Amino acid sequence: GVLKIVKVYLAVKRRIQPGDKMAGRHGNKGVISKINPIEDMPYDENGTPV
């Protein structure tokens, strides 16, 4: 009972935002809380922000 089927493939680009569930491998499940500006991130002596 169907003549011709058209299938359309949307391809979104989802990235990190405050609320995406995200975990390490050792069952340390967490959720993103705030996309912290790179300056706010604590930096070590060399200045590489974690």
Partner: protein, 221 residues
């Protein structure tokens, strides 16, 4: 209060160079250090690409023939193209590579003003002498990070993410310089790590300029 002044811009490399201020009063060392580091990492005029136009590719998830890399990660490479402008605020760069061989950034048909600083930054690997990539790369100014979506049109346009952040790693390290005869003049250094598109001296100049301008919110001139 002795004022700080630029005394060394030692160009340890083209990618990064430390900038040192000879005098700084007790306490102001870490103050100026943190202020400069924060204002540099946050806001510095960048030049990263904003819009590419492949020749025969419609959407960014297509795969041109001949290129050893799909278009998406070609864009991913492009968003870190270390380029700088001098006279314009937006420019469209044309690329026409042909024949087998990686497409180094030097292949970009640059002008006298827009000059790339990493002519070895590979974009894509052409794997056929009868295949030729052709890109109309649009390069703009700006500051901070601007994604593809939050910037308010034809099919061929591929809205790449924006990364207007010439600096990649800033780290100040106060020291102790025995200036004249007064001790406690903590010499300050800035082990900044740009992407080769901003002069470290001029970087510090503009960062201090914006710090003063925003600090002039509550003070007279």
């Amino acid at each position: 209060f002795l004022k700080p002044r630029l005394v060394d811009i030692e160009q340890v490399s083209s990618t990064h160079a430390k900038v040192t201020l000879e005098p700084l009063e007790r306490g102001f060392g870490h103050t100026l250090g943190n202020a400069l580091r924060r204002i540099l990492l946050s806001s510095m005029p960048g030049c990263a690409v904003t819009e590419v136009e492949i020749d025969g590719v419609l959407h960014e998830y297509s795969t041109k023939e001949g290129v050893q890399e799909d278009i998406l990660e070609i864009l991913l490479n492009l968003k870190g193209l270390a380029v700088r402008v001098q006279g314009k605020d937006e420019v469209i760069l044309t690329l026409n590579k042909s024949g087998i061989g990686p497409v180094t950034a030097a292949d970009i048909t640059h002008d006298g003003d827009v000059e790339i600083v990493k002519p070895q930054h590979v974009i894509c690997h052409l794997t056929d002498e009868n295949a030729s990539i052709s890109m109309r790369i649009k390069v703009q100014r700006g500051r901070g990070y601007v994604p593809a979506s939050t910037r308010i049109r034809p099919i061929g346009r591929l809205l790449v993410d924006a990364c207007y952040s010439p600096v990649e790693r800033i780290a100040y390290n106060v020291e102790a310089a025995r200036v004249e005869q007064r001790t406690d003049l903590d010499k300050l250094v800035i082990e900044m790590e740009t992407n080769g598109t901003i002069d470290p001296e001029e970087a510090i100049r503009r960062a201090a300029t914006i710090l003063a301008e925003q600090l002039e919110a509550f003070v007279d001139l």
